[PDB]
Amino acid sequence: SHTVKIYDTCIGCTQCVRACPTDVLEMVPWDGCKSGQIASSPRVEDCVGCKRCETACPTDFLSVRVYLGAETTRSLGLAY
Amino acid sequence: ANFIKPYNDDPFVGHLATPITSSSLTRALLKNLPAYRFGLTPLLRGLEIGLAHGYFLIGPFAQLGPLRNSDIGLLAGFLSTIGLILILTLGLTIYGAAAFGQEKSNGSELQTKKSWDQFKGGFFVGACGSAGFAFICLSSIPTFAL
Amino acid sequence: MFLISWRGYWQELIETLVWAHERTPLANLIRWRDKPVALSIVQARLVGLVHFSVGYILTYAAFVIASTSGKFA
Amino acid sequence: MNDFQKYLSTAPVLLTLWMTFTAGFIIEVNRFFPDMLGLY
Amino acid sequence: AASFLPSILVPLVGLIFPAFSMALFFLYVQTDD
Amino acid sequence: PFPTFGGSTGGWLRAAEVEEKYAITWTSTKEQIFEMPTGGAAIMRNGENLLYLARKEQCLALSTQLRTFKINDYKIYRIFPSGEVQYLHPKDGVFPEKVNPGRTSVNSRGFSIGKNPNPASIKFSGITTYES
Amino acid sequence: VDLDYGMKNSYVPATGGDGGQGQFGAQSPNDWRVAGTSPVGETSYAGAADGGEEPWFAEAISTVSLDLQKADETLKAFTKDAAAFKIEEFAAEKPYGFTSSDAAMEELVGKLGYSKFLEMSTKQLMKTWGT
Amino acid sequence: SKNVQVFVEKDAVETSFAKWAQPGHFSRTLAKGPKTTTWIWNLHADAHDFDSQTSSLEEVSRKIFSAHFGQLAIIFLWISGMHFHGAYFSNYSAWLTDPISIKQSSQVVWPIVGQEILNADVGGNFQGIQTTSGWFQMWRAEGITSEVELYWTAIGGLAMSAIMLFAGWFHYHKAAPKLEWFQNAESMMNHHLAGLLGLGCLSWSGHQIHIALPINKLLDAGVSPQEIPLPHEFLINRDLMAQLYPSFSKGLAPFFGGNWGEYSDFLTFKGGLNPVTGGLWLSDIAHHHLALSVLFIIAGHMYRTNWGIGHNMKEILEAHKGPFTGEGHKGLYEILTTSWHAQLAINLAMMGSLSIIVAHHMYAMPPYPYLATDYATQLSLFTHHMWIGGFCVVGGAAHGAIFMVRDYTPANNYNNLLDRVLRHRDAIISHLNWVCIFLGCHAFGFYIHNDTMRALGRPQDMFSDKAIQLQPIFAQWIQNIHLLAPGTTAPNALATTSYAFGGDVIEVGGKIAMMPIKLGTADFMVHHIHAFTIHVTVLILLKGVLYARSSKLIPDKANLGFRFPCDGPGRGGTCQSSSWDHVFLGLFWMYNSISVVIFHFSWKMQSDVWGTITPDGAISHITGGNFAQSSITINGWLRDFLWSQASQVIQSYGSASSAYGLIFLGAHFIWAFSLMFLFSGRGYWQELIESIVWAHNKLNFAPTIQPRALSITQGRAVGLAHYLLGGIGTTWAFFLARAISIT
Numbered sequence A: 001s002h003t004v005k006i007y008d009t010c011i012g013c014t015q016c017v018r019a020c021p022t023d024v025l026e027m028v029p030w031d032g033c034k035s036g037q038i039a040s041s042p043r044v045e046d047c048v049g050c051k052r053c054e055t056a057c058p059t060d061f062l063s064v065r066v067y068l069g070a071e072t073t074r075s076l077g078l079a080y
Numbered sequence B: 001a002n003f004i005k006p007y008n009d010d011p012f013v014g015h016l017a018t019p020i021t022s023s024s025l026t027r028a029l030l031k032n033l034p035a036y037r038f039g040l041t042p043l044l045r046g047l048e049i050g051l052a053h054g055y056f057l058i059g060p061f062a063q064l065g066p067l068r069n070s071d072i073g074l075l076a077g078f079l080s081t082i083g084l085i086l087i088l089t090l091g092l093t094i095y096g097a098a099a100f101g102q103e104k105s106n107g108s109e110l111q112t113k114k115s116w117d118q119f120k121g122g123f124f125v126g127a128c129g130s131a132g133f134a135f136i137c138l139s140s141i142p143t144f145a146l
Numbered sequence C: 001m002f003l004i005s006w007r008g009y010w011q012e013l014i015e016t017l018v019w020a021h022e023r024t025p026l027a028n029l030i031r032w033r034d035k036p037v038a039l040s041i042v043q044a045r046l047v048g049l050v051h052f053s054v055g056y057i058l059t060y061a062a063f064v065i066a067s068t069s070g071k072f073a
Numbered sequence D: 001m002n003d004f005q006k007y008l009s010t011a012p013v014l015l016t017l018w019m020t021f022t023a024g025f026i027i028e029v030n031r032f033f034p035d036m037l038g039l040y
Numbered sequence E: 001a002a003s004f005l006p007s008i009l010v011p012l013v014g015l016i017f018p019a020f021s022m023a024l025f026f027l028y029v030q031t032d033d
Numbered sequence F: 001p002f003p004t005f006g007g008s009t010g011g012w013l014r015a016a017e018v019e020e021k022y023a024i025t026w027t028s029t030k031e032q033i034f035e036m037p038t039g040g041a042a043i044m045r046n047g048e049n050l051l052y053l054a055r056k057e058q059c060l061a062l063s064t065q066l067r068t069f070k071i072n073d074y075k076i077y078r079i080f081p082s083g084e085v086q087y088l089h090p091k092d093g094v095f096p097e098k099v100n101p102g103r104t105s106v107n108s109r110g111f112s113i114g115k116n117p118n119p120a121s122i123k124f125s126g127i128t129t130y131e132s
Numbered sequence G: 001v002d003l004d005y006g007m008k009n010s011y012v013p014a015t016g017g018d019g020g021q022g023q024f025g026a027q028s029p030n031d032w033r034v035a036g037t038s039p040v041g042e043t044s045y046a047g048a049a050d051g052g053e054e055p056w057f058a059e060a061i062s063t064v065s066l067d068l069q070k071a072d073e074t075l076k077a078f079t080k081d082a083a084a085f086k087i088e089e090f091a092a093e094k095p096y097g098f099t100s101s102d103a104a105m106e107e108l109v110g111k112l113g114y115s116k117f118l119e120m121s122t123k124q125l126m127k128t129w130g131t
Numbered sequence H: 001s002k003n004v005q006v007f008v009e010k011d012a013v014e015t016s017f018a019k020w021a022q023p024g025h026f027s028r029t030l031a032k033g034p035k036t037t038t039w040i041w042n043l044h045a046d047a048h049d050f051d052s053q054t055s056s057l058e059e060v061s062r063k064i065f066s067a068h069f070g071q072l073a074i075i076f077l078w079i080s081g082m083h084f085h086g087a088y089f090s091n092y093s094a095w096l097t098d099p100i101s102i103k104q105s106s107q108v109v110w111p112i113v114g115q116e117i118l119n120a121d122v123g124g125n126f127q128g129i130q131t132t133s134g135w136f137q138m139w140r141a142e143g144i145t146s147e148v149e150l151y152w153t154a155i156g157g158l159a160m161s162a163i164m165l166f167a168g169w170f171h172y173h174k175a176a177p178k179l180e181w182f183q184n185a186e187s188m189m190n191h192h193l194a195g196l197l198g199l200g201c202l203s204w205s206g207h208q209i210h211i212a213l214p215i216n217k218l219l220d221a222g223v224s225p226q227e228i229p230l231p232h233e234f235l236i237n238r239d240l241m242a243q244l245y246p247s248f249s250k251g252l253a254p255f256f257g258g259n260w261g262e263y264s265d266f267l268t269f270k271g272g273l274n275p276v277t278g279g280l281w282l283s284d285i286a287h288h289h290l291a292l293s294v295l296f297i298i299a300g301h302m303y304r305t306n307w308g309i310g311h312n313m314k315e316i317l318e319a320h321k322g323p324f325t326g327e328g329h330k331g332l333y334e335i336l337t338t339s340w341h342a343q344l345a346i347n348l349a350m351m352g353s354l355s356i357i358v359a360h361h362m363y364a365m366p367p368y369p370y371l372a373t374d375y376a377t378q379l380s381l382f383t384h385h386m387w388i389g390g391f392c393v394v395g396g397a398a399h400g401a402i403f404m405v406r407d408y409t410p411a412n413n414y415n416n417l418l419d420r421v422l423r424h425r426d427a428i429i430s431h432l433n434w435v436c437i438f439l440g441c442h443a444f445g446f447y448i449h450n451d452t453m454r455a456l457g458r459p460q461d462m463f464s465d466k467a468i469q470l471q472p473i474f475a476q477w478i479q480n481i482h483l484l485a486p487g488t489t490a491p492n493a494l495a496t497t498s499y500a501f502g503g504d505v506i507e508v509g510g511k512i513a514m515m516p517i518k519l520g521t522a523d524f525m526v527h528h529i530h531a532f533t534i535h536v537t538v539l540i541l542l543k544g545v546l547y548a549r550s551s552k553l554i555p556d557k558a559n560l561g562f563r564f565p566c567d568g569p570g571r572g573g574t575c576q577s578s579s580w581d582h583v584f585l586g587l588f589w590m591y592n593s594i595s596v597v598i599f600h601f602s603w604k605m606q607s608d609v610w611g612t613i614t615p616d617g618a619i620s621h622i623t624g625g626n627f628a629q630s631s632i633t634i635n636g637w638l639r640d641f642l643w644s645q646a647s648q649v650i651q652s653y654g655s656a657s658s659a660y661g662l663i664f665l666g667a668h669f670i671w672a673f674s675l676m677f678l679f680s681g682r683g684y685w686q687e688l689i690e691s692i693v694w695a696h697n698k699l700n701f702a703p704t705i706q707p708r709a710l711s712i713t714q715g716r717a718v719g720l721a722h723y724l725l726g727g728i729g730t731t732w733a734f735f736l737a738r739a740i741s742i743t
């Protein structure tokens, strides 16, 4: 459904993965930052488009960007 | 005593067993209604439903329509009812096409194309005929006086 | 209505209506093939602007015509 | 005193006082020189 | 007579035509080619 | 192993029976009252507990509440109409907020957000700048 | 367990503007567009639940559930690869008197259950398997 | 020891001006300092939210008690000013002598900039603004007579204001009560229901029986105000009272004995309205308060305190449970004794509801001398109290929601009434939605149907008293019941409680005070519209309370708070999903509801009640009875009401009513101004600000407190505020200007 992309400016603060309401983001090993960790979006099929993740990023400009797109039952948050 | 319990003993389903939802009265009435009754063929189900709805529809038009005070008011009311029945029948036809498709197999399941078509046909006949019956009845009203 | 009221409120209300239709006997027989949902953010803006615009033009159109014709014609 | 003066130095308070003064002087000018649409 | 045309066409244009058109659109948007 | 609840009109609907359904499980050391996302209050059982919901978010919301009770053994599954089940969370056994060796990066662009291509350049291509 | 059951759906990702099937598929294999209620003694949604004497509330009769025993299997299957990576690393770090990966797994999971096994660092594992 | 005791902490907070110089001290976040303009706005928006400023109920409670003293002080100063202005800037004396001709005025404008035009020739060799609050009538009923007395009550008011302010300081800085003291509901109710209300009524009855009644009788008879004996004289010389009421001769002997009948001279159940003044008989009012006093005092002895006898509210609440309601009312006591928001909800709703009742009962049964004939005052009071009520009711709902989000605890509420309500919320909201649609389609449809029919030249097909008719049969029936009550179901009464139900036309000064108000098809149509408006308001507000903590869309709304902008652009859009936003939308509907009600009052009265009657029986209503056949269509309201009754404001220039014209225009402007906040978004504004800041920077200067755009929530608030001010303001001027003329 929606598209979430992570950029090299990430600092591995883990704040984004701790804010997702649907477990779409994970922290994976990396060497480009001091923390030695980067964020990934393995399960974008469950993204609802809340953008809470973006609100949590501390980088000058979001290192995590959510681009809204095709809509499915899951993305539209339909319990019915 | 608790008169409200989880439906079907499932504490997580979105429904509750209230006196209104599950009382002998409600169960009995719904079981014997033409729509859910057992044994009725698709055509007969439609017929009963149509007979019921056509009889009460002639009233509103006949007593409150544009030509209510005219001598031909009842006739006009009948025509108006027939028009409404046609509109509703179009809806039924269209619904069936979209919901069921083009070729069916199960058969005798109100929820199939063939069965739905039969159901629709019954409704039309029953409704129009019922409206006609009301016309005959409303032509001369009994005072039931001895 | 479309301009001041936004989606959240309406979406929640529509959800309740869905529950009702699915739980009301007789009507349960008929069901939708396109899930009922609230209008989108941009859609509401467009719908509202159109309603505002159409009303704006129509009301003045009547005034400019009836006032002029009613007095000088 | 020092603290109270600081409160009196807050933005809202100072604005009100200044505007009251400005309004007053304008009103007073019109009281003594009234009805002017030009410098005579 | 042409004078009768207003009373024969208006009923069709404002009632029959719109209905069939709407029905067709519904059938078109509810179909899965 | 269902927790003690008296029922609500905010439970699951047909989609749960014809499209897809979810389920969360956890273990408790005491019987305590929690608030369910559907609406209302329920009492968990002293031991295993299972509850069904219609959305993953509803399940994960409850997990947050569970963490307050110091319960961190929750598991979430998706049950399809045919009976197939998918284990969803914690997927690898380790919560996502904790780096676990063995997880690969996905959807990562190796440049600042400002280095994406210009829209005009990719015209009549079908791709987007952020996917280019 | 068909780990691809969800992925095997009718959804077809579009060119641009779609994340894709993701990790567990984007949509249910089954179509939600089923029919409505049916008369007593009839069924509508294919493998639907008979409403008995209350066909009007048939949709409220659950037929989809999770077997606790089956639940264990799905947990193991979907986390098989992770377990493999974990044990592999443990093996690489010169295990004391090592035997076979599988054997080690059984021994290491006999203790520390399975969930605990998945959440333990190779170092902790080696300490645990010192014996 | 004793269950009910007084616990107070001495010297709790030091009095100093240090915190005054540290704006934002109350908040941890704001205290750090200003970095953007948002800090300024937040300072003012979080000033009185004590729950967020402290985590101890005792502290929050202490602040509330003291803050209340502050409001009381302000109220006292307000009343004091009014009496003073009525002593030094009014024509009360002249009006007192000739109430029918002289017009009430208590405000005078300085002769600056032609504003003097606003000083009208009210009468009595006096020029000022015609006030419409009804002070003169009240003072006459009390028996003021002089302006010296008004001065003294003003001084008393100032003194009282000071005492209250001291009390606030004292009970917060020097003697602050502890939480245990506050949590004594039974005692509080006993004291407030027997002391505040019971003793209050009894005391008032004393004034009315010994001072007001006698003086007013003399005034009505014709005695010149100067010739009426001073109040103290009546209190001392029993003989004087005996002359007026021939029972004081017997003294209090009849009272101690059981012969209360002898006091029938001043305690009566006459009913109806005094023919001379057009107001309720004071004798009846005196008996009213006396009777109420006894009732309240008795009621104040129902709850247990420190002597065993009495009721414990907890026990009463818990016992009331049934087969369909689980644990029943268990848990409510704790909620109402541990949550200020919950208490405010109930109290605020009831207070607002009372105001609406006051509005209805105070016009049908005019309570003051020479009030009914003053159409301006009557209209002003009805509308004023109708509004105050609407706001308060919506406020109750708001605080109810704040409770659910901040104080509700699942543990303390298991299978109680509250829990069960939140467990079938979908059903409640779904049904109410339908009810609203049903009512709205049918009620408003009637009007649209009629408009179409009249325009198509088919008047015989309209829903009118001359065609298809929809008569209010039930209401017509109740009216008859009330009309025939005197002498039957109410044997000892002498007349109808109100002439509205039926009776004769009471006229004072050639003007109609009250007349039977009849109900027909038009009334049916409007009443049902009122139902629709109120029902929709409840839907929005109730939905907010029930879905405050969670929803299918946002399962964790509680954590987000009571006032969050949204959850995001996802889920199709989650804008305005907070409970605060529901209150925001509810206020708009409350505005609509009240507006229609006040308009109904204005047109109905000016058409079927108010007017003049000749010496013989010829009644000429102000508008001429147009309500019956014109209020059945929307065009009628636009033409026969708004367009026609607005001729006064639009033509007020050059007169003492010019102010209303200017305000009418100003209000329209503010209403429109608000629409820019209600339709736009923060994004556009923030970007515009960026460009503007560029200019300032280009000239080497820019504020350190970086300029930022108003928050999403504040934008909505600013819009609603201006919208309400503008709309209400417009009607305010419209009504007042029209009323001045009709009077």
Ligand code: CLA
Pocket (backbone or CB within 6 Å): C001, C002, C004, C005, H433, H436, H437, H438, H439, H440, H441, H442, H444, H445, H448, H536, H539, H540, H585, H588, H589
């Ligand atoms: C004149 C402007 C206007 C109108 C007509 C409406 C209409 C409505 N608002 Mg609304 N609203 C408005 C302005 C308006 N709003 C504004 C400015 C705001 C901002 C505060 C809101 C905020 C708002 C909220 C927050 C809520 C509403 C709700 C409602 C609905 C009430 C239910 C009802 O009576 O249905 C009847 C609707 C009618 C328009 C009646 C007239 C229609 C005819 C006369 C009846 C017969 C027509 C028939 C059905 C079809 C004819 C066929 C042919 C014409 C094609 C209704 C749709 C409530 C709602 O949805 O709950 C139900 C609700 O919660 N409004």
Ligand code: CLA
Pocket (backbone or CB within 6 Å): B057, B060, B061, B064, B065, B066, B067, H441, H442, H443, H444, H445, H446, H448, H449, H452, H461, H462, H468
């Ligand atoms: C919504 C309010 C409303 C109502 C009640 C009416 C009523 C009426 N209109 Mg009118 N009209 C309205 C709005 C309304 N109008 C609006 C908004 C417009 C503008 C578009 C018009 C334009 C209009 C025209 C142009 C004409 C009328 C006409 C009529 C009359 C014919 C009635 C008819 O044929 O209905 C038929 C009704 C039905 C078939 C069904 C009625 C609904 C049923 C009774 C509900 C039953 C519910 C049931 C109790 C549920 C429980 C069941 C359980 C116990 C088993 C009637 C007096 C005609 C006329 O002669 O005027 C007098 C006419 O020519 N109307």
Ligand code: CLA
Pocket (backbone or CB within 6 Å): B065, B066, B067, B076, B079, B080, B082, B083, B084, B086, B087, B090, E010, E011, E013, E014, E015, E016, E019, E020
């Ligand atoms: C151009 C479009 C058009 C036309 C020609 C008409 C024509 C008519 N309308 Mg009307 N209407 C329209 C649009 C139109 N309407 C719209 C858009 C609305 C919504 C606002 C309404 C709402 C409306 C109401 C509420 C009412 C009418 C009524 C009437 C009838 C009054 C005259 C008469 O003798 O009644 C007396 C009636 C008769 C003599 C009966 C005539 C025979 C009927 C019409 C046969 C209909 C069969 C038709 C083929 C079925 C359609 C099939 C479908 C596939 C299209 C007349 C037939 C009134 C009426 O009585 O309705 C019937 C009435 O109450 N109209």
Ligand code: CLA
Pocket (backbone or CB within 6 Å): D013, D016, D017, D020, H077, H078, H079, H080, H081, H082, H084, H085, H089, H107, H108, H109, H110
């Ligand atoms: C509800 C309270 C109330 C209200 C609304 C009014 C309103 C009015 N009174 Mg009135 N009055 C009141 C109570 C009230 N009074 C009381 C209780 C008394 C008894 C003391 C009086 C005694 C009184 C007299 C004796 C007179 C008025 C007059 C007036 C009119 C002119 C007001 C004025 O001075 O303008 C001009 C305003 C000023 C000169 C004040 C200057 C503005 C100050 C400096 C701004 C405030 C500074 C700010 C708070 C700084 C903050 C510091 C921080 C510590 C808080 C006006 C209609 C006058 C009038 O009608 O004359 C015809 C007049 O002569 N009143």
Ligand code: CLA
Pocket (backbone or CB within 6 Å): H064, H065, H068, H069, H072, H181, H182, H184, H187, H188, H191, H192, H194, H195, H196
């Ligand atoms: C019989 C005793 C008594 C009386 C008269 C009151 C009266 C009042 N209480 Mg109260 N209270 C009492 C006992 C009493 N309480 C007890 C025992 C408790 C503890 C359980 C409380 C706890 C309490 C709280 C927690 C609060 C109140 C509040 C209030 C006020 C409500 C606002 C109102 O109606 O304004 C009416 C206003 C007036 C009538 C103005 C006059 C007020 C003075 C104080 C009356 C005192 C008597 C007076 C001097 C007459 C003496 C008679 C003499 C002339 C012969 C009101 C003044 C609220 C408030 O706002 O307090 C500030 C509030 O929050 N009370």
Ligand code: CLA
Pocket (backbone or CB within 6 Å): H044, H045, H046, H047, H048, H049, H050, H348, H391, H392, H393, H394, H395, H396, H398, H402, H563, H580, H583, H721, H725
């Ligand atoms: C008994 C009355 C009463 C009391 C004690 C409270 C108390 C409270 N309310 Mg509440 N409320 C009430 C009535 C009341 N309310 C009513 C009637 C409504 C419906 C409109 C509301 C709606 C409401 C909302 C929606 C919210 C509160 C909140 C709050 C809390 C913080 C208030 C705050 O931010 O202070 C600061 C106070 C202000 C900034 C108000 C200043 C006045 C503004 C600027 C409007 C002035 C209009 C003015 C009269 C127009 C003059 C025109 C002229 C210029 C020409 C506090 C516990 C807030 C909260 O967070 O609760 C926890 C919150 O979100 N209340």
Ligand SMILES: CC1=C(/C=C/C(C)=C/C=C/C(C)=C/C=C/C=C(C)/C=C/C=C(C)/C=C/C2=C(C)CCCC2(C)C)C(C)(C)CCC1
Pocket (backbone or CB within 6 Å): B051, B052, B053, B055, B056, B125, B126, B128, B129, B130, B132, B133
């Ligand atoms: C309220 C209520 C109720 C209900 C009621 C109702 C709702 C009723 C209805 C009724 C109805 C609604 C009925 C109907 C009827 C119908 C009819 C009776 C019909 C008939 C028809 C016929 C007989 C035939 C026709 C025809 C045809 C078929 C075709 C051909 C032609 C002809 C004509 C032959 C009761 C009492 C139960 C109880 C209480 C509650």
Ligand SMILES: CC1=C(C/C=C(\C)CCC[C@H](C)CCC[C@H](C)CCCC(C)C)C(=O)c2ccccc2C1=O
Pocket (backbone or CB within 6 Å): C001, C002, C005, C006, C007, C008, C010, C037, C038, C039, C040, C041, C044, E025, E026, E029
């Ligand atoms: C009322 C309202 C709705 C609900 C309005 C709805 C659902 C409109 C429904 C009625 C319209 C007329 C569609 C009805 C179409 C018919 C069912 C026929 C369709 C036939 C198809 C073939 C097209 C929103 O979704 C919304 C979203 C965001 C901000 C404000 C609002 C808002 O104010």
Ligand code: SF4
Pocket (backbone or CB within 6 Å): A004, A019, A020, A021, A022, A023, A024, A025, A046, A047, A048, A049, A050, A051, A052, A053, A054, A066
């Ligand atoms: S937009 Fe929401 S669901 Fe998607 S990754 Fe961010 S927080 Fe998770």
